[PDB]
């Protein structure tokens, strides 16, 4: 079941390729993470402390 | 046979001045041969082969004599199957002991027993001069020298030059990978005619084409999923090898490189070994890894570490040594006839390689590179 | 063109705060980005292309765009032709400056300029995170990072990821080899379908099979004798290359490896360059060598040093810079239309290599290995 | 027509393959050196400071 993030991507994903994101909340997981879901339904692990990740989160929240 | 891999426990407490030898001859200390020469002089004059009791693992190969006519040179050279990545430029040094010896003929030879040993790397050739000598007897010489850990790895060549084809001539290189684990690479000369006799030692790049593991795309094709339990095993032991069977798992590569969500796991199996019910010596497993500390992005400190665990039989029961800093751990498998090398998923990014060493078998599992 | 090699003189005196940049941005110093950033924010704000004036040698190449539409990534990557041996693990670090940029479009794009650069080696990948940033402009970002010298060499791949196929996009790695010589490696993007367009840069192992030079046996055969003056020249400049002809000499391999007596020589010629009558930019020759100082046989301190000399044309006359420490020297040849790279015979044992850099040509001469 | 030594052999030569020996005297040479002549008339450079070299000389001296 539960999936987690073990590595973060250091390459920014163009906002246009992002459909959504959720945050890791499970205790079974080791690292804090943001999980972006692409327009192709693919998930990529991202670092919360990074500038591009926060900006991407804003964009996604301000279009709902 | 002049080839093989052997294990043994090492209790410095039951070895004459074992602590001093370890601190002054196998630890980069005084830049002078005196302190260590003085220890060996006393110890080895009482027991010529005491140094062998310090090898936790001994890997030997048979190398053919290569003749030169004009100077009286019989030369044996070989590429020792170093158990693990030596190190990163950031590491310190390792003090290695080099031993050149042979059988004593019952008939006094015309000349004295001579031997010149050298460890050459692409750029620099570390020679064991007279100034490196820490012990000498009629048919054995011991040299000491500090070399940067990064050099001690595949690439470094071992050449020993003797004046004659001494019976039983052999050169040994004692390489301490940690304070409690020394590995000895030996080169035992054989007939000029015969072909090289390599020990059953292999090096395996478990994550070839690591880019493949950047995502979970090939997870299904590789058999690395929750259902399989992140287990895709492949046989290490060749067809006609010893009665023990070792296997490696390639699924850990995903936890090391995936930026895609992976199934949550308590632990991952890097490898396991079966046939313990008939093994009569201990099994050593050594890990190479970067410490998980947070480092300055401006200056990414790359100090590589090494830890070695030991699985031993006590009254028929196999138990392992434990270690706090060590990322891996050995545990009994489904039964006492099996041992598994485990690790926590989150340790993979920093894991560089693990080596499995036991009676007649050595496997160097690397999680980087494609060669 | 979109590929090539070029030179120029670098006079910090006539460069806005050249000394400070060089000391806090091109030298491993403060382990934080504040110092170099403050300097760059003031200088590049008034002169955006200032850093170009700091590259003594510039070597560029075109590398095809490579896409990953799945994420909108436009990637370029390549293997810079490093001018010489990075170093030995005993060396310190090198503070390289990384620059990613592109032309400023006439129309405001769908997003802001972006680029992530990473320098990956066998064991570790050095990523230029935001924590490494020392300057950001609308269409240019500059990162700073300290890397062990031994890593900066062939084997280090360079990768730049963009979100658009920006015109004029290119990344540059500035690499100070000494306090006065900076070599810049550049990767310029060319259209996808395009084939790699490398610059004229070669690497030659002058002494393939160093054992061939252990004695004088092959002297006559190689044309390395007192009669010829130890000069067996071979051509470096390919057939359709620039109008400057460069040749290398293989005879010095004897002075580096022979234990047999050799003809006494005042100096040896490592290489020469003819055609200076039409060269309108300076020439640089960098040498990599170990220190001739005495070592401790128990712990040979193998630190690799780098020194670069420069031949320039002043009113039609070509003269060279000099250095009491540098084993090589540059002197005009039989006429001002020729330059020779010289060395005293006794310096070869410690000479690891020399590199020739001039307009459209770069030759890396190695006196070790077989590659 | 002077020859010199630029490197020393770190390998001892069998005293039964050593014809004779001589020392470098010419000011044209850079390093002190013992040059050994083998029975096959080939010369090899040797560092006077190594013990095996001085024993070879002591031997070659006695058989004359």
UniProtKB/Swiss-Prot annotation, chains A, D:
Changing residue 51 to A: Strongly reduces heparin binding. Changing residue 3 to A: Slight reduction in activity. The record marks 11-12, 51, 59 as: Involved in GAG binding. Expressed in the seminal plasma, endometrial fluid and follicular fluid (at protein level). Expressed in monocytes. Keywords: Chemotaxis, Cytokine, Disulfide bond, Glycoprotein, Inflammatory response, Pyrrolidone carboxylic acid, Secreted, Signal. GO terms for molecular function: CCR chemokine receptor binding; CCR2 chemokine receptor binding; chemoattractant activity; chemokine activity; protein kinase activity; signaling receptor binding. Its main location: secreted. It comes from the Eukaryota. The record marks 17, 42 as: Involved in GAG binding and receptor binding. It is found in: Secreted. The record marks 6 as: Involved in dimerization, receptor binding and signaling. GO terms for cellular component: extracellular region; extracellular space. The record marks 1, 28, 31 as: Involved in dimerization. Glycans are attached at residue 7. One of its GO terms (biological process) is astrocyte cell migration. Disulfide bonds join 4-29, 5-45. Acts as a ligand for C-C chemokine receptor CCR2. Signals through binding and activation of CCR2 and induces a strong chemotactic response and mobilization of intracellular calcium ions. Exhibits a chemotactic activity for monocytes and basophils but not neutrophils or eosinophils. May be involved in the recruitment of monocytes into the arterial wall during the disease process of atherosclerosis. Monomer or homodimer; in equilibrium. Is tethered on endothelial cells by glycosaminoglycan (GAG) side chains of proteoglycans. Interacts with TNFAIP6 (via Link domain). Belongs to the intercrine beta (chemokine CC) family. This is C-C motif chemokine 2. The chain holds residues 31 to 94 of 99 of the full protein.
């Amino acid at each position: 079941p539960v999936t987690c993030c073990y590595n973060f991507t250091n390459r920014k994903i163009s906002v246009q390729r992002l459909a959504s994101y959720r945050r890791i909340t499970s205790s079974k997981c080791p690292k804090e993470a943001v999980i972006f879901k692409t327009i192709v339904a693919k998930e990529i692990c991202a670092d919360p402390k990074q500038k591009w990740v926060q900006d991407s989160i804003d964009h996604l929240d301000k279009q709902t | 046979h002049s080839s093989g891999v052997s294990t043994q426990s090492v209790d410095l407490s039951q070895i004459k001045r074992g602590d001093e030898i370890q601190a002054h001859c196998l630890t980069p200390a005084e830049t002078e041969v005196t302190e260590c020469a003085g220890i060996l002089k006393d110890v080895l004059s009482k027991n010529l082969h005491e140094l062998q009791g310090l090898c936790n693992v001994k890997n030997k190969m048979g190398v053919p004599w290569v003749s030169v006519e004009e100077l009286g040179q019989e030369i044996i050279t070989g590429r020792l199957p170093f158990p693990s990545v030596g190190g990163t430029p950031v590491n310190d040094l390792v003090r290695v002991l080099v031993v050149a010896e042979s059988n004593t003929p019952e008939e006094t030879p015309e000349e004295e027993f001579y031997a010149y040993v050298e460890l050459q790397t692409e750029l620099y050739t570390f020679g064991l001069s007279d100034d490196n000598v820490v012990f000498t007897s009629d048919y054995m010489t011991v040299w000491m020298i500090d070399i940067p850990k990064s050099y001690v790895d595949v690439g470094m060549l071992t050449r020993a030059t003797f004046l004659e084809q001494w019976p039983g001539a052999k050169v040994t290189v004692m390489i301490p990978y940690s304070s409690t684990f020394t590995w000895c690479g030996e080169l035992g000369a054989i007939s000029e005619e015969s072909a090289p006799q390599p020990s059953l030692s292999a090096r395996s790049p478990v994550c070839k084409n690591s880019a493949r593991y950047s995502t979970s795309k090939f997870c299904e094709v590789d058999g690395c999923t929750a259902e399989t339990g992140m287990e895709k095993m492949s046989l290490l032991t060749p067809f006609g090898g010893p009665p023990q069977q070792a296997k490696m798992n390639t699924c850990p590569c995903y936890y090391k490189y995936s930026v895609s969500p992976l199934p949550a796991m308590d632990h991952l199996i890097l490898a396991d070994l079966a046939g313990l019910d008939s093994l009569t010596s201990p099994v050593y497993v050594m890990a190479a890894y970067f410490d998980s500390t947070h480092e300055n992005p401006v200056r990414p400190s790359s100090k590589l570490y090494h830890c070695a665990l030991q699985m031993t039989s006590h009254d028929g029961v196999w138990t392992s040594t434990s270690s706090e800093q060590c990322p891996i751990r050995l545990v009994e498998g489904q039964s006492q006839n099996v041992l598994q090398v485990r690790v926590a998923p989150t340790s993979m990014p920093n894991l560089v390689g693990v080596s499995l060493m036991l009676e007649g078998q050595q496997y160097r599992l690397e999680y980087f590179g494609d060669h």
